[PDB]
Amino acid sequence: NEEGRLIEKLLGDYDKRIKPAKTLDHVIDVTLKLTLTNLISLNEKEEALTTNVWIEIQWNDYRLSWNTSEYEGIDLVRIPSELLWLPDVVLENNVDGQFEVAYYANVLVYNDGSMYWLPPAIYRSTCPIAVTYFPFDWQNCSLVFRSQTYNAHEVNLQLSAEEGIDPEDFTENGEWTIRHRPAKKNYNWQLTKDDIDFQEIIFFLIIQRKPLFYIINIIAPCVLISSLVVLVYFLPAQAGGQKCTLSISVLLAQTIFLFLIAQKVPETSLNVPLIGKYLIFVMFVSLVIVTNCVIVLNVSLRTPNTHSCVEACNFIAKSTKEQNDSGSENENWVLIGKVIDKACFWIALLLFSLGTLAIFLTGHLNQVPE
Amino acid sequence: VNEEERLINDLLIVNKYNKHVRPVKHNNEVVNIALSLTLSNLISLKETDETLTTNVWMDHAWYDHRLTWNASEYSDISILRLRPELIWIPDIVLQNNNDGQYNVAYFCNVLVRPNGYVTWLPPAIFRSSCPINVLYFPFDWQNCSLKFTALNYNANEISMDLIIDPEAFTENGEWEIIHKPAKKNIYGDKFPNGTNYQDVTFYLIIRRKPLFYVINFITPCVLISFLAALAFYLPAESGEKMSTAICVLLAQAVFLLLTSQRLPETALAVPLIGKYLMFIMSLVTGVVVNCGIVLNFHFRTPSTHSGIDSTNYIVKQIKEKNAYDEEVGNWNLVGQTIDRLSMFIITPVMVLGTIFIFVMGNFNRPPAK
Amino acid sequence: SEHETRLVANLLENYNKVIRPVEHHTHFVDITVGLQLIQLINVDEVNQIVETNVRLRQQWIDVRLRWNPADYGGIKKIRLPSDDVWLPDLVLYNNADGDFAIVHMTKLLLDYTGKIMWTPPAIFKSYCEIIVTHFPFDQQNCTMKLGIWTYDGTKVSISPESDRPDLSTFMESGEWVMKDYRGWKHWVYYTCCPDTPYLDITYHFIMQRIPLYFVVNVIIPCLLFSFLTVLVFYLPTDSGEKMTLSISVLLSLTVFLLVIVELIPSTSSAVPLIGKYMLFTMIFVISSIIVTVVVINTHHRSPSTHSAIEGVKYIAEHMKSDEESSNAAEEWKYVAMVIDHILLCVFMLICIIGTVSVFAGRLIELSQEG
């Protein structure tokens, strides 16, 4: 039906770069929305991410409501992307890595100027997550994206679901989790003093993490380690004196392990994000353990050395007996461990307090945001 | 305006100009081309793989015999600009150092002399496979060879004739640039039965040697050494801490072997000469042996490693008797041997420790020659 | 030639590339997919990405491509390059990790009559389920869906041909190993839109892992360390003069076990293996730990130990006796009746625990072996 002739008609008339514009002072109304589908990389030390976004694009151009041969042959249409006005998308706040295959995707015409286009894009971005978003109370990732291109005086974007998410297409390769996701539609004029307002799209993303696996990676070493120094503490009451050298081997080994745990995981928070909180209990719990641990030896270090003619000769020999006894005896008196035994229970409660102060407080920072 | 618009419509670059025809003034020898090479920067040096990423100013000159000008072209301005399409562009090829395609030295803005001669000379980020070998590491650190030219054309379609170096040295080279000659040529080969295309041959003779390996590297050899050194001093001042004298060898020993381990690691980074690697290993060994000798000769030793009268006579008999036992131990002592030992350790410290810095110095007198 | 020039020119003139073979409102464009993965190049557990060999067998028909002695006449069916065609925008839904390799501008074959195939030699980047369940010995089935991008079944329709296994031409340079793979068809209409949307090929990759070199290295030190530990018990009861001797030991061992753990988490981090696989190495490796700890604290456990010329000989002899007493006290201290008990105490335990360990070992060897 006129199929040929109608096509040929308006392709006389057809203008590309021009918006279907009454005039050039009062803009078009454009519809947009995004459905997450892939959160590829969460580099939080370096606070950037890559996501496959469904760029729901919609807008009106009556440059083409149709008659007879188009509107009514097919209320629906597939005409090439590369044939008119298309907005250049980007996350003012996030857009970090040019769009990927997110453009040059066939566009959807109505027959009264309804226009709809979705497509998919993997790109980089730049959310929160510096030295916090570690905690239990999540950081809202706030991404606003619009058109790169023009400013709101001849373009005007519309929005979605500020309320309802997130895990529609959340990565399963999270150790993370999302618990809400805000989205509002707004204008451009900021702290900085920028006028000629260019609309945009705000994307809040408060999310959880911490399904902990390493937890007990961290957990076991340093329980092991507290019982390891529990051996250092109770095995000295039992021990003899050749247990000086004993003990020490232990402290060598004790921190060879210690620091090697301190090298490990420090690295970890460098290569992904950062939060100090948890950081701080480990090293410093770990340091005070050390602390007291060699203090302990300085406690069984202290102490200066505990660390007839018949009868002329009977006279002197019966003195070497009493004599050396007295001396030997010296050592006795000197190392009668009143210190040691109690030094077991000294550290014991102290050990307990350390333990406790920590796990107790971890039982809290898990039991408030529980 | 001089009939300008109109004249650059007269000439028509692309339309009057044969873009598919080489303005060689028809059949003769060639249009006469000259290349100029100026490095703007050297960003990375690889030893292991013979590969260098460097930036060059591709200064190019050749006559466009259709680019002679008249009044509103020549004169109006003896010098103008013109894009890559209004533009025969060759393929100067880094013949043997262009195993890394030329970037941003392809078709950018060129300079239009006022009667054909044209001038195109921008930036080249490139990668090269220079004459490394496992031998660009001896101190000479050789001469890097590179040839530049329009690849395609022959000595009857092409002729290229011919600057330093430290024009734009990368100061964040661990190496040092001694020199930098430049001389063009032309050449006939094996498979071609003609002579042809002429080229820019530029040899780079350099030298390298951080002032920062010396530092941590000699540090651990005097350190180490003194352990071997101290091992033997301490078997005098008390050689009875047997276990602990030992421990030291376990200790000095494990420390020595990974040392040399970090050695081949930077190694692979970069293929190592035979000069340096021998003094190291041949000597470390040196020690090694003498730590194993240390061993045995430090713990070799098996030991040093009337009836009232009848009764107390038994004891003065167990007395003296086990005094020959007891003594059996001091036998083992060997203390007139003391000074010797530490002596015969000093002799060989002085022979080796010197032998090395002796080899130092005998190769540190001839280069100053 | 048989119509030769008149052939060629007629054809350019009356033919619109851009036009999609739209033959009244019906069948749409009927176009079928058929993937034959010639071979695979590489695959990454960590980042469930694969680079593979596909020859895409694409069929469809344009009745506008039937001919006479002026097209067929010339030469039967021929070779026509792409361009003139309408090319579906194929896409691996939950895959599709980028754009098809060397896809664009290749050739195809037309018959005198019409029928066209486009079966080109692809190799591309993929994206698939591994889940924590892929490094199963029992595997996970990689769910991979394929079909027409942004066109439903009204406008056009991607269909199936086709079941085939995965191990049909599986990469012979995997470490690894398949069970089977199957692919069935489906039509996805959505709860969105009352409409009839496109069609899809769903792949199911069912394959289990582990070239067996790895496996060996790691478990034999654990048997090796078995024996050391073995001494660790035997040494001590048989003479606790080198107690600190074995101190050595305990230090240099658990660090070893430590070092193993670095190696297989990074690989964790580097290759996801279903987590509950790790508590195997967990308890097991950890009992080496609780065993030590105890055995060698307890090894320490012990308080102790770990006429008148005649009556001068009896004051002296009486000094040799009491101390007679006392000698026997401290040896009375380190008995060799009960160190025997800890020996068989825990060794039974170890062939308990051992056999237990052998449990999950043997168990998912009852399910792999099949």
Binding site: - | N27, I246 | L228
Partner: protein, 370 residues
């Protein structure tokens, strides 16, 4: 001018850009392929990936570009870009690990009665069957198959240069490696109507002789410490402790050796062969260190009335001395000598074995590079 405009104009009047250099279906046009190699940069021994560089020399004849007076007789040789014709494309069945760099679409040498010469050097990403079989001194084997990638020899024919050209034609001098050969065999895959690929063989030889040398040290040096620690025991038996420090150390050492090795096969791995038995030699000074340890283990103890006093005395000292003399009996050093010479057998036998293996490896599986 001698009818220049005329030739020039006929040619561009009868040339077809889009067309095959043939007249219908014979025969086709017999193209010459032959590559002068430049050098090779990287053998990714590990994965079997080959990045080299060569010249793509193509050459056939265009009866469509026979010239006349001025570009024939004028200038018998003229340079002209490509673009115009059928170019090779070529993929390497195996191989073709990725694109062409300076290979295609480069100017060419066109002779008068239309011989064509095309002279490009190029880098190409390939990966051949070097396998995990590129380390046995016997070395191996590979297929390098070049050929186009939609074109099925049916409208032309491929033919090479030499067959002796060698692969030590341009063998890289830089190579720590080496060059047995590369033949060249043209093939046509009958599983296809298409005439495909050409197979180029790698008889390659890898002898970088630099660090095996100090690898020989660990094998001989290690035994030092071995002979040593089994030469220490009946040397100073009170090696009691110091013994175990020997082996903590000796062990950890041959362990860390197992650290590095897996890491260096990293880029690099093959045939365990070297590994396989030094592994054995490993497990050897494992278990032999440990048995001897058992050897030590060993020792189930060690691991007047005036004359009435006298008597008392006489008994005290003698009594206990033969009891402690007993222990002497119980740990005499008859073993140390016999087993340190069992140590003699064990270790100078196991030593002269992999010395043999090694002896056999260099001399036996060398030759068959042909």
């Amino acid at each position: 001018s001698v009818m220049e405009d005329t030739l020039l104009s006929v040619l561009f009047e009868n040339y077809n850009p889009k067309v095959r250099p043939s007249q219908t279906v014979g025969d086709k046009v017999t193209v010459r392929v032959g590559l002068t190699l430049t050098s090779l940069l990287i053998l990714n021994e590990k994965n079997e990936e080959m990045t080299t560089s060569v010249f793509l020399n193509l050459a056939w004849t265009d009866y469509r570009l026979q010239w006349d007076p001025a570009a024939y007789e004028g200038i018998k040789d003229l340079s002209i870009p490509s673009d115009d014709v059928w170019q090779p494309d070529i993929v390497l069945m195996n191989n073709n690990d990725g694109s062409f760099e300076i290979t295609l679409h480069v100017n060419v040498l066109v002779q008068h009665t239309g011989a064509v010469s095309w002279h490009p050097s190029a880098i190409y990403r390939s990966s051949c069957t070097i396998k995990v079989m590129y380390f046995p001194f016997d070395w191996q084997n590979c297929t390098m198959v070049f050929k186009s990638y939609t074109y099925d020899t049916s409208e032309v024919i491929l033919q090479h240069a030499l067959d002796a050209m060698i692969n030590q034609d341009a063998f890289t001098e830089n190579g720590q490696w080496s060059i047995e050969h590369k033949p060249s065999r043209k093939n046509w895959r009958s599983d296809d109507p298409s005439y495909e690929d050409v197979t180029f063989y790698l008889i390659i030889q890898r002898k970088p002789l630099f660090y095996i040398v100090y690898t020989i040290v660990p094998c001989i040096l290690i035994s030092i410490l071995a002979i040593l620690v089994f030469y220490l025991p009946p040397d100073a038996g009170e090696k009691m402790s110091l013994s175990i420090s020997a082996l903590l150390a000796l062990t950890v050492f041959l362990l860390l050796l197992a650290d590095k090795v897996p890491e260096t096969s990293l880029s690099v791995p093959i045939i365990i062969s070297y590994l396989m038995f030094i592994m054995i030699l490993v497990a050897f000074s494992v278990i032999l260190s440990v048995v001897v340890l058992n050897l030590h283990h060993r020792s189930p103890n060690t691991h007047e009335a005036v004359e009435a006093i006298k008597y008392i005395a006489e008994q005290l000292e003698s009594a206990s001395e033969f009891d402690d003399l007993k222990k002497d009996w119980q740990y005499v050093a008859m073993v140390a000598d016999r087993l340190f010479l069992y140590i003699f057998i064990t270790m100078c036998s196991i030593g002269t074995f992999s010395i043999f293996l090694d002896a056999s490896h260099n001399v036996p599986p060398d030759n068959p590079f042909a």
